[PDB]
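Morning F.,

Quick status update on the modeling queue. The single chain you submitted on Monday has been processed. Sequence for confirmation:
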Amino acid sequence: EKPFSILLMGVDTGSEGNSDSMILVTVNPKTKKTTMTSLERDILVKLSGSKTNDQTGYDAKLNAAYAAGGAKMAIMTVQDMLDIKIDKYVQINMEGLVQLVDAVGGITVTNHFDFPISIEEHEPEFTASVEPGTHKINGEQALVYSRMRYDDPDGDYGRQKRQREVISKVLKKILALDSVSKYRKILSAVSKNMQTNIEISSSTIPKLLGYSDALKSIRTYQLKGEGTTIDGGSYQLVTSKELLKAQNRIKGQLGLKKSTAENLKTTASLYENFY
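Structure tokens below.
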């Protein structure tokens, strides 16, 4: 019944060598209330990780954490930035997201535009497309559907909406599976492109089924910093106020003691100490 946290680590799943996404999820298993906080990849932090890692203890973007030290560095860096202990962990890359969509049998979307949703003009390695109308689409099409931006009058906001739709529809299919063999069919298809310490067993299936009607009330939040240019690159410096607010909101969902401005603990490069 105890609330717990999940770090979702999207390895090069975002939209120069990589665009990671990190989402901190809180889950209350009793009330089913769930929240998701997106952590901007450009946020400047001191990396945490193994003492034998050459980059542990130096400042970098959050975007660099997984490339520098793997799952351990990503977990430890987020833990020290938010001053919490992370309970559960799910990591997947772009190849695995494509495989996941196919493994659940596809998803159904509607293209409301008067032309195909496609991105090859702007990102030539992605040639799949979604014709106008309603279609059951494969994983390569789902990637394009969640990335297209320049043909949308609402720009990156229309894009974020479509990406939200895709992840929501995939999660709905996963959490609807009612047997361990059905889960293991998906685990077989994605294979090592997804790693987690979430137990998927006949014992836990009843509980995951119980979250089917929690995905419709998830509150979403974003942790962002003040934009700064350092050596030609784009960085974000979180303010003391905004970090405290994000930490305490998550702590509040997790049943943990909140911090004050005077005892705030973080490895983030705070704006007020940078300047």
